């Protein structure tokens, strides 16, 4: 199936990604709090809803929140500033708070039911966000020799998400707090950092196949833009 791409709202970041966030892939965005990873998740939850000439996939979004990061008023602001109806935009986002890592796994199985339901409609699910993927796994699988079991549980969770992305042609977008020696299984990893007082900077990590460079974007009333 053709890969679909969702615009991030920034021409700079879209160029770095090769057009935007891809379906049939897991894109992992990592950085410090406020680096723009949650702002990007919120922007994408709106952008995916737009028609393709506007950078979307005429789709709906599903958002798994592990750290109480979801702000429905922020989605409303992005939608209104982009010429969209905020209530209709919120109606196209399914939201769930994951209480722990095991509940986070169950939520992914429930996501598949909604995805299957809407697959052949005029507005299928096209984006699944997990913000953040690792927080519960890092707090639960902790201490002496916990690395092996945590990485096995994370590897399994990521395999389930890769399956939803590939089987249903959806973009899976996950965020992560930031160690350097651990393995990662995302299709694409993006490092975000706070820039020159106002900007945010993005770099691709371990992607020889994709272009060398860094993107610069801003957090605005429209979510993410140049
Ligand atoms: C004014 O404050 C607001 C606060 C939040 C919202 C959000 C956008 N909308 C909702 O909360 C809506 C309205 C009430 C129920 N509801 C759900 O989305 C219920 N969700 C689910 O049943 C569900 C199930 C499995 C899932 C697996 C993965 C990800 C998400 C999943 N969501 C809107 C306004
Ligand atoms: Ca952020």
Bound molecules: ligand NZW, calcium ion
Radius of gyration using CA atoms only:
16 Å
Q: What is the subunit arrangement here?
A: monomer
Percent of residues in beta strands? 25-35%
Function: Involved in DNA repair and in homologous recombination. Binds and assemble on single-stranded DNA to form a nucleoprotein filament. Hydrolyzes ATP in a ssDNA-dependent manner and promotes DNA strand exchange between homologous DNA molecules.
GO molecular function: ATP binding; ATP hydrolysis activity; ATP-dependent DNA damage sensor activity; damaged DNA binding
Protein name: DNA repair and recombination protein RadA
Organism: Pyrococcus furiosus (strain ATCC 43587 / DSM 3638 / JCM 8422 / Vc1)
């Amino acid at each position: 199936a053709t890969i679909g791409r969702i615009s991030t709202g920034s021409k700079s970041l879209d160029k770095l990604l090769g057009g935007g966030i891809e379906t049939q892939a897991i894109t992992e965005v990592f950085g410090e709090f406020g680096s723009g990873k949650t702002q990007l998740a919120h922007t994408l939850a709106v952008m995916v809803q737009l028609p393709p000439e506007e950078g979307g996939l005429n789709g709906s979004a599903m958002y798994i929140d592990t750290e109480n990061t979801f702000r429905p008023e922020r989605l409303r602001e992005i939608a209104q500033n982009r010429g969209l109806d905020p209530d209709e935009v919120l109606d196209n986002v399914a939201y769930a708070r994951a209480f722990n890592s095991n509940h986070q796994m169950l939520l992914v199985q429930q996501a598949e039911d909604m995805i299957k339901e809407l697959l052949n409609t005029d507005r299928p699910v096209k984006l699944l966000i997990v913000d953040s993927l690792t927080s519960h796994f890092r707090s639960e699988y902790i201490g002496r020799g916990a690395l092996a079991e945590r990485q096995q549980k994370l590897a399994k969770h990521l395999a389930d998400l890769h399956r939803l992305a590939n089987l249903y042609d959806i973009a899976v977008f996950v965020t992560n707090q930031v160690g350097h020696i651990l393995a990662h299984s995302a299709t694409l990893r993006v490092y975000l950092r706070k820039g020159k007082g106002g900007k945010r900077i993005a770099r691709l990590i371990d992607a020889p196949h994709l272009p060398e460079g860094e993107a610069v974007f801003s957090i605005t009333e429209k979510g993410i833009e140049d």
